[PDB]
C-alpha cells in the first residue's frame, strides 16, 4: 500500500550511476560531475542502504598517495555521518587507454601485470571499507576481429589472473569473495565470458572455485536475447549468485542501463518473484544511468524509481504466490510434480517398470493440457492489480 | 586446387537433413520422403564418411519389435554395402505430442520416465551400430511463460536424467560419451541450457562429468548473437568439444539451418581455422536443411556444398597461418605475448616488481598500436584468394 | 473495475488462431481440428464482435464448386445465429507447395497468374460476406539467397499484382480496401516489404494509392527490434492504418504469436494509449496462437485473455491521460511545445530572428532538464495501479 | 589482378572517420586529434576522390566568424593542392548538449529554430565548396520512454523542418539535394524514421519530394536485422538512392562502424553486385571508425582496406555475372521469367484464361525445383575465387 524504501531493503547504487555525466558515443556531457560525498548523502535521504565504487570513481586516476588518503577520508566521513555501507567494490580496467586491448587478457604482458597490481591495490581498500564482494567486469577483454585474440590463450591468462587474486586474498586472510559480471559485447565487438553460463563454466576451472561467483546484470543477458530469470535460476542452482546488478533494457541493442522496472517489465516481475522466493539475501544493486535528457532532479527521480518499482513488484509477486487460486492453478499445471524425483526408485526399477514404456499410454498423456495460459493470465492480473 | 571430399575428411550428415521434406510453420511438405537406405547410398557417392540418426528417423514411432528389426537390418546392409559409418546417434524427444512440455523436464512425472526409457532403448541400438557419441538436444525443455516452469526444479530433473543415463552406460560397460546440444529458443519460447556456456556449467554438476561434453551448433549460438568460434574455443579449453554441428545462419531470427558456408562466412573461416589448428578429430557433422524451394537435385547440390565450402575454407585458413607475412603480423600484434604467462615469477615477485606499477609508464604503453586492422585485412585477402 | 468484453469493443479473431492445431517446425499437432462453425459460436460466447478468414481456412483447398457453396452456407448460418460479423478476409498464398517461391513475386510466371486468380476469387467471397478490408501478407515473397530474387524486378511484379487487384475492385464497384501486412522474415530468410515503413513507401508507387493501407502486426515489427507504437504513429500520420493485428512477442526470435498483453507489456500499454487517443475505429483483431501445450479449455482461456488485457490497458491508459498530475508533467516536459509549429512565422522571419541563432543562449537551453523520468514513472505507476 | 584505387573510383571519406579519436561510452580517447588538412592529404595519397564533413568537424563549435573564415580557407587550400572534392556535407545536430532531446523534433521550440538556423548556415558553406548532396542524420530525434514524444506531432515537426529547408534552397537557386540517413536506435532508445523504408515513406509527404532521397548505411539497417541489399534495391526502385554510407557490422548490437568488407561479407558482395549492375553513379562513401586499438598507421591501413575490399568484391561480382555457367543457372532458376510482366494481356484476359486457374496444374508447378542452391554455390565459388 506504501512503497517507501528503508535501508533494511538493502538497496545499493554505484557512484557511477547517479554520477554519470551523460557522455555517450555521439555527445558531450549534459550534467556536471557530482562529488561522491554529495551522492552518498542524497542517496541516504532516498532510503538507500549503501553505495559501491570503482577505484577511479573514488580516487581520480594518477592520484598521489596523499591525495588518495584525503579522498578516502572524506568519503569515510560521509559514510559515518549517514549510516551508509559499502558492500561491494570493483576496479576500473576499461576507461584508460592503456586498457584498450584488455586488462587481464591484453596481448601485452606488461599491461596484464599492471592490471593485476591496480586490482590488488583496490582490494585492500575495499576490505578496509568493509566490502564483502569484489566484482570484476572484463569490459575490454575481447576482440573486434578473429585473428587479434587466441581465445584459448586468453582464457589461460584470465584463469591465471583470477587464480593470483585468489592466492592474494587467502594469503592475506581477507573475507571477501569475487563475482564475475558477464556481458556479451560493448565496448568490444565480442567480450569473453559473454553470458552467465560462460562465467559459471569458467569458475569451475579455477584453482579455488568456492571463492568465485557471478554478478549477472539484467540488461547484459537481454543483449543476447536470453531470459534473465532463467539465468539467475541457474546461478542460484549452482550456489553462485553472489551479487546482482538491476536495471532495464529494451531488447537487443546497445546497453541502455535504464532504471529498474523499465525495459522488460514482465521479466522484472519474474525476477523479483524468484529472488524473493529463493531468499536471496545480498544487496539489490542498481547499475543504471539516468538518461542524459535529465537534470539533477531527474537523476534523483530516476534513482527513486528503481527502488519503488522493486517494492511494487515484490508486493505483486507475493500476492501472486499467496493467492489460493494461483496455488490451485500451479497444481493444475503440475508444478508440484516437477519438484518430485523422476526415478527415486532407481535405474533398475525404472527399467523393469512396464508402466514407464511397454504399457505407457502415450496418447492419453499427450492429450492432457498443461493449463499454462490460465496460470499466466492469473500472473498478469496480479502484476496489473486487476484481481476480482 | 581441388575440393573433392573423401571419407577421410570425416564428413557426416544426419538422416533428417537431406531427408527434410520441407514442412515449415506456414506450409506443407514440398518433397517426398526419402528412404534411409537411399540417403546412405547417395551420401556415400558424394564422398561422405558417415550418417547419424534420431531413433524415429530410422524406426517409425510405435513400430512393432519385429518391424524394428527389419528396419535396422536394411539399414545395416546399406552401411555394409557402402563403407559408411554411424559415429553419433540421438533420441527424438520433441516431435510427438506427448513431449509438448518436455522430455526430461516435463512437468508430468510419467512423461519424464517414458522419455528416459525411450532414450535408453536407443542408446543400446547406437552402441550396436558403433556410435561413439550420443547427442541430446532438449528442444522442448523450456517454457513460453514464467510460472509454467520452476527452473531450479527443472535443472534438478535434468541432472537426475543425465545422471541415470550415465549410470546406465557405465553399468553396461559401454564406450559411448554424451554430448549436450544447446539452443536458446525455438520451438520453446526459451529453452533450458541455452548456450554452450550454460551447458558446460551444467555438466560440472553431474555425478560423472567426464562422460559428458557439448555438441555446439553454428546457427544456435548465432541465434543469441554470440561469437561461435569464441564459444568453441571455450569448449576446447575445457576439454569438452565432443562433437560439432555445422550449418549457416543469417543473424538473430528463426533457426535457418542453411548449408555450411552460407550465413556468416567470416565466422565460418575462423571456425575452420580453429578446428584445424586445435587438431579437432571428431566428425564434421552437417545439421542443415536444403531449402524447401529445392527438388532432389538441389538437395544433393546443397549437401555437396557443405563439404566443398569446408574444404575451401580449410585451404584458405592453412594458407593464412603458413604465410610468413602473417606470422610477422601476429608478432607485431603480440599474439606471442598473449601465450606467455603473466606472472610465472609468482604473486610475491609481482607485488615487489616496481616495473609493474610504481614505475610502469602507462602513457607509453597506451600509445602502442595493436596493429589489428592490418592483420585482419591479411586474413580477408587470404579468405578471398587475393594475395599478391 | 469490470473487464468484460462486448461486441461493441470490436474484438475480432481469425479462424486460424483458435483453430491452430499446434504443428510447429519440430512437432506434430497437439489438438484436433476445429469446425469453423464451432469457433464462431465459441467466440461469440466470449464476447467477440467478429471473425476473419483465409480462403483455405473456410473452404479446403481443391474443393469442388459445390462443396464450396455448402461450406459457405453453413458458415453464414452460424454468423446469422450469433450476430458475428466478418470485417476482414485474406488469401492463403503461403501453405501449398506451389507457393514455395512466392505468389505475386514467384519467379515462375504461371504461378504469379494463378496467385492472382486465387486472390480475385476470394475477394468476391469477402465482399459477399460484408468484409471491408482485404489483407495481404506476402509470407513467401522473399529469398534465402542473394541471387535467387532480383528485388527491383520483384517489386515490379508486386506493384503489377496490386495494381491489377485495384483495377478489379474498382471495375466491379466494390467498397473494399486493401491492407498490406509486413513481416521481416519467417518463413523466407528475408521477406519483401519487411516493415511498416517499407510497405508505406511501396503503396505510394501504386496506381491508386488511396485504396491501400497497412495491417501492422505487433510481433512482426518487434522481430526487427523496432518500436511498434512508433510505427503505428507513422501509419496514423500517413492516414494508412486500415487494420491492426494484435499479439505478443518476446524480442528478436521466431514469430511467437503469444496472446495480446504477453511479450512486451509496456509496449502494449503505449500501443493502446495511442489507438484510443487517436480514435482508431477499426477492428481490434487478434492474430495469435494458443501455445501447443494447451488443450481446448486453454485455447478459450488464451483468447479471453487477449480481450481482457486490452480492456485493462485501456483503463490504465485513460487514467494516465486524465490524471491532472500527468497533465502537468506533460507540460513540464514540453509536450505542449512539441505540438506548436516551429516556424509559423515563415522562412524569412526565421532567418531574420536573432533570437534563433546570433543571440540564442545555447548553454541556458542545454541546462534545462526534460523531466522525462518523472513522467515515465507516473506512467509506470498508472500501468501497475499503484497511484497514491 | 591489381586492387589499387584511383579517384575515378569515387571513394570518399568523412573527416570524422579517420579523425575519430577513440572515445567510446566506456573509455577515453586513444589517438590525438587530426588536423583536417592532414586528413585530406593522407587520404589523397591513398587514392581517395574526396572528403565530407559535418559543420563542427571543420569549424569548431562557437567559432568567431573570423576564425571560421580561416578554417575554411586552409581547408580550401588543401583541396586545391590535392585535387580532392567535397561531394557531400552534413550538420552536427547531435553532439552539443542543447540537442539532447533532438534538433528538428526537440520538444523545446527555441531549440528547433536554432537547429534549423545552424543547418541553413552550413548548407550555404556546402554549396560554396561544391557539394551536391546534403545529408541529415537525426541521431537525437527519438525517445527512451513512451510519454516523452508524441510521434505524430514529432513527424509534423520533422516535415516542417525539411519543408523549410526545401523552400530555402529553392529560393536561393541552389543545386543541392537532401538525403535522409535512417538509423533504428543509438544514441536514442528508438530513433524516428528508423529504417530506409520509413524514410522513403516520409519523403512522399514532403511538399517537394523530388528534392529528397535516402543515404542508407550498411550497419544501420543491419542493426534491425534487415537485408541491406534488399533495402537498397527498394531505394533504387523508388529513384531515391542519392548517396550511400559503407561500413561493416556484426549483427544486432551497438553500431560498430567497422571497415567496409568486415562484418557480413556475403551481404557486402551482393551490395556491390547491385550497385554496379544498377549503374549507381554517386560517391562510394565510407562512414567507419578505425578501432580504438589502432595507432595512426592502423588508421590508414583500415581506410585503405575499405577501398581494397570494395575493388575485390567488384571484380568477383563482375566475374559472377559474366560467367556463362551462371547465366545458364539464372535461367534455370527463372530469373528471366521474374522480369517479364505477369499479365501484360490485361485484367480481362487474365480472368478469362483457364490456363491460369481452372486448368492450371498446381501439382506439376509445385514439383519444379527452383535450383537456387546450385546458383548460390556458384556465387560462393566466385566470391572465394574457387572456380574450376
Ligand atoms: O564495472 C562493473 C559494472 O557493474 O559497473 C558499470 C559497468 O558497466 C559494469 O556493468
Ligand atoms: O536432435 C539433434 C539435432 O542436432 O538434430 C536436429 C535438431 O534440430 C538438433 O539440432
Ligand atoms: O495471412 C495474414 C495473417 O495475418 O494471418 C496469419 C499469418 O501469419 C498473417 O500474420
Ligand atoms: O551524421 C551523418 C553520419 O553519416 O556521420 C556519422 C554519423 O554516425 C552518421 O552516420
Ligand atoms: Mg550495463
Ligand atoms: Mg554492471
Ligand atoms: Mg538448428
Ligand atoms: Mg543440431
Ligand atoms: Mg505473426
Ligand atoms: Mg497477421
Ligand atoms: Mg553508424
Ligand atoms: Mg552515416
Residue nearest to atom 4 of ligand 3 (CA): C287
Instruction: Provide the shortest C-alpha distance from residue A265 to chain D (in Å).
Output: 13
Kindly state whether C373 is in contact with chain A, defined as any CB-CB distance less than 8 angstroms: yes
Q: Residue B375: in which H helix or E strand, if any?
A: helix B372-384
CA B221 / ligand 1 centre spacing (Å):
25
List, as one string, the DSSP characters of B231-277.
HHHHHHHHT-B---EE-B--SSSS---BPBTBS-HHHHHHHHHHHHH
Instruction: Provide the shortest C-alpha distance from residue C42 to chain D (in Å).
Output: 35
Task: Give residue A353's Cα distance to chain centre.
Answer: 45
**Cβ-Cβ contacts under 8 Å for B245 (sequence gap 6 or more):** B181, B215, B216, B217, B218, B220, B285, B286, B287
Cα–Cα distance measured from residue D106 to residue D92, given in angstroms and rounded to the nearest whole number: 15
CA B133 / ligand 8 centre spacing (Å):
13
* Residue from A62, D334, C268 nearest B363 by CA: A62
Read off the DSSP letter of residue D187: S
- In Å, what is the CA distance from B171 to each residue of A356, C172, C291, D262? 20, 77, 40, 52
Nearest beta carbon to residue D187 from set A24, A99, A187: A24
Cα–Cα distance measured from residue D149 to residue B66, given in angstroms and rounded to the nearest whole number: 70
Cα–Cα distance measured from residue D203 to residue C200, given in angstroms and rounded to the nearest whole number: 11
**Chain B residues whose beta carbon lies within 8 Å of the beta carbon of residue C61:** none
Cα–Cα distance measured from residue A333 to residue A319, given in angstroms and rounded to the nearest whole number: 19
Rg of the Cα atoms in chain A:
23
Cα–Cα distance measured from residue B92 to residue D278, given in angstroms and rounded to the nearest whole number: 49
For ligand 2, say whether the CB of B56 is within 6 Å of any of its atoms: no
Cα–Cα distance measured from residue B357 to residue D250, given in angstroms and rounded to the nearest whole number: 36
Q: Are B300 and B42 contacting, i.e. CB atoms less than 8 angstroms apart?
A: yes
Cα–Cα distance measured from residue B232 to residue B246, given in angstroms and rounded to the nearest whole number: 12
Instruction: Provide the shortest C-alpha distance from residue C166 to chain D (in Å).
Output: 10
Cα–Cα distance measured from residue B262 to residue C377, given in angstroms and rounded to the nearest whole number: 46
CB contact under 8 A, A161 and B342: yes
B285 marked ligand binding residue:
no
For ligand 2, say whether the CB of B218 is within 6 Å of any of its atoms: no
Would you name the residues of C annotated as active-site residues? 54, 57
- In Å, what is the CA distance from D386 to each residue of B284, B311, B320? 21, 11, 16
Q: Are D52 and D128 contacting, i.e. CB atoms less than 8 angstroms apart?
A: no
* B142 torsion bin: left (phi>0), alpha (psi -120 to 50), beta (else): left
Q: Are C147 and D379 contacting, i.e. CB atoms less than 8 angstroms apart?
A: yes
Q: For chain B, give the number of residues.
A: 388
CB atoms within 10 A of CB B95: 16
Helices C265-278 and C372-384 meet at what angle, rounded to 10?
A: 90
Q: Are D274 and D315 contacting, i.e. CB atoms less than 8 angstroms apart?
A: no
Cα–Cα distance measured from residue A186 to residue B206, given in angstroms and rounded to the nearest whole number: 34
CB contact under 8 A, C385 and A388: no
> H helices within B21-108, ranges in order?
36-46, 55-58, 65-82
- The C-alpha cell 522484472 sits at A268
Q: Are C203 and C212 contacting, i.e. CB atoms less than 8 angstroms apart?
A: yes
- The C-alpha cell 575454407 sits at B313
- The C-alpha cell 554438476 sits at B205
CA D239 / ligand 11 centre spacing (Å):
23
Residues 272-291, chain D, touching C (beta carbon < 8 A): 273, 278
Residues 288-347, chain D, touching C (beta carbon < 8 A): 330, 333-335, 337-343, 347
Cα–Cα distance measured from residue B168 to residue C125, given in angstroms and rounded to the nearest whole number: 62
List, as one string, the DSSP characters of C57-104.
HHS-TT--HHHHHHHHHHHHHHHHHHT-B--EEE---SSSGGGTT-ST
Atom of ligand 2 nearest to the CA of B14: 5
Cα–Cα distance measured from residue B199 to residue A98, given in angstroms and rounded to the nearest whole number: 35
Return contacts of C298-302, CB within 8 angstroms, 24+ apart.
C298/A369, C298/A370, C298/A371, C298/A372, C298/A373, C298/A374, C299/C18, C299/C31, C300/C18, C300/C42, C300/C46, C301/A371, C301/A373, C301/A374, C301/A377, C302/A373, C302/A377, C302/C259
Q: Is A12 helix (H, G, I), strand (E, B) or coil?
A: strand
Q: Are C108 and C97 contacting, i.e. CB atoms less than 8 angstroms apart?
A: no
For ligand 2, say whether the CB of B57 is within 6 Å of any of its atoms: no
User: Of A103, A196, A287, A288, which is best to mutate to test ligand 1, by the most ligand atoms within 8 angstroms of its C-beta?
Assistant: A287
User: Of C13, C14, C54, C246, which is best to mutate to test ligand 3, by the most ligand atoms within 8 angstroms of its C-beta?
Assistant: C14
Cα–Cα distance measured from residue D31 to residue B6, given in angstroms and rounded to the nearest whole number: 51
CA D220 / ligand 11 centre spacing (Å):
6
CB contact under 8 A, B278 and A152: yes
B287 marked ligand binding residue:
yes
For ligand 3, say whether the CB of C53 is within 6 Å of any of its atoms: no
- The C-alpha cell 503469444 sits at C258
Kindly state whether B171 is in contact with chain A, defined as any CB-CB distance less than 8 angstroms: yes
Q: Is-cis flag, bond preceding A241, omega within 30?
A: no
* B202 torsion bin: left (phi>0), alpha (psi -120 to 50), beta (else): alpha
Instruction: Give chain A's domains with CATH numbers.
Output: 1-388 (3.20.20.150)
Buried b (16+ CB within 10 A) or exposed e, A276-295: eeeebebbbbbbbbbbbbbb
* Residue from C300, C283, C306 nearest C89 by CA: C283
Closest ligand by atom to B53 CA: 2
Nearest beta carbon to residue B101 from set C28, C100, C293: C293
- Enumerate the β-bridge partners of residue B89: B53, B134
Cα–Cα distance measured from residue D70 to residue D277, given in angstroms and rounded to the nearest whole number: 43
Q: Residue A319: in which H helix or E strand, if any?
A: helix A296-322
Angle at C295 between CA C293 and CA C296, to 5 degrees: 140
Cα–Cα distance measured from residue A12 to residue A87, given in angstroms and rounded to the nearest whole number: 8
Angle at D287 between CA D286 and CA D292, to 5 degrees: 115
Which residue of chain B has the CA closest to A167?
B347
Instruction: Provide the shortest C-alpha distance from residue D338 to chain C (in Å).
Output: 5
**Cβ-Cβ contacts under 8 Å for B299 (sequence gap 6 or more):** B18, B31, B290
Helices C296-322 and C36-46 meet at what angle, rounded to 10?
A: 40
- The C-alpha cell 483455405 sits at C56
Residue nearest to atom 1 of ligand 3 (CA): C137
Cα–Cα distance measured from residue A374 to residue D177, given in angstroms and rounded to the nearest whole number: 57
Our answer to whether residue B57 is catalytic in this structure is yes
Amino acid at each position: 500500500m506504501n512503497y517507501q524504501p528503508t535501508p533494511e531493503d538493502r538497496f545499493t547504487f554505484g557512484l557511477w550511476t547517479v554520477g554519470w555525466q551523460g557522455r555517450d558515443p555521439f555527445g558531450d556531457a549534459t550534467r556536471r560531475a557530482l562529488d561522491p560525498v554529495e551522492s552518498v548523502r542524497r542517496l541516504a535521504e532516498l532510503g538507500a542502504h549503501g553505495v559501491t565504487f570503482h577505484d577511479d570513481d573514488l580516487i581520480p586516476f594518477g592520484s598521489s598517495d596523499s591525495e588518495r588518503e584525503e579522498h578516502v577520508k572524506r568519503f569515510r566521513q560521509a559514510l559515518d555521518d549517514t549510516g551508509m555501507k559499502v558492500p561491494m567494490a570493483t576496479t576500473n580496467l576499461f576507461t584508460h587507454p592503456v586498457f584498450k586491448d584488455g586488462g587481464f587478457t591484453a596481448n601485452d604482458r606488461d599491461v596484464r601485470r599492471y592490471a593485476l597490481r591496480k586490482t590488488i591495490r583496490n582490494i585492500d581498500l575495499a576490505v578496509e571499507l568493509g566490502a564483502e564482494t569484489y566484482v570484476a567486469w572484463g569490459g575490454r577483454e575481447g576482440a573486434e576481429s578473429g585473428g587479434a585474440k587466441d581465445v584459448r590463450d586468453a582464457l589461460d591468462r584470465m584463469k591465471e589472473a583470477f587464480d593470483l587474486l585468489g592466492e592474494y586474498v587467502t594469503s592475506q586472510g581477507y573475507d571477501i569473495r569475487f563475482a564475475i559480471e558477464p556481458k556479451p559485447n560493448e565496448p568490444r565487438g565480442d567480450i569473453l565470458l559473454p553470458t552467465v553460463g560462460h562465467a559459471l563454466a569458467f569458475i569451475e576451472r579455477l584453482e579455488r572455485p568456492e571463492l568465485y561467483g557471478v554478478n549477472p546484470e539484467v540488461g547484459h543477458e537481454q543483449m543476447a536475447g536470453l531470459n534473465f530469470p532463467h539465468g539467475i535460476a541457474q546461478a542460484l542452482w549452482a550456489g553462485k549468485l553472489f551479487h546482482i546488478d538491476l536495471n532495464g533494457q529494451n531488447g537487443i541493442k546497445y546497453d541502455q542501463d535504464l532504471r529498474f522496472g523499465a525495459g522488460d517489465l514482465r521479466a522484472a516481475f519474474w525476477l523479483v518473484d524468484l529472488l524473493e522466493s529463493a531468499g536471496y539475501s545480498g544487496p539489490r544493486h542498481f547499475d543504471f544511468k539516468p538518461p542524459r535528457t535529465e537534470d539533477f532532479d531527474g537523476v534523483w527521480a530516476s534513482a527513486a524509481g528503481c527502488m519503488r518499482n522493486y517494492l511494487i513488484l515484490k508486493e505483486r509477486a507475493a500476492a501472486f504466490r499467496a493467492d489460493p487460486e494461483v496455488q490451485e492453478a500451479l497444481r493444475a499445471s503440475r508444478l508440484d510434480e516437477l519438484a518430485r524425483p523422476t526415478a527415486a526408485d532407481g535405474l533398475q526399477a525404472l527399467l523393469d517398470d512396464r508402466s514407464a514404456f511397454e504399457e505407457f499410454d502415450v496418447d492419453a498423456a499427450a492429450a492432457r493440457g498443461m493449463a499454462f495460459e490460465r496460470l499466466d493470465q492469473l500472473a498478469m492480473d496480479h502484476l496489473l492489480g486487476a484481481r476480482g
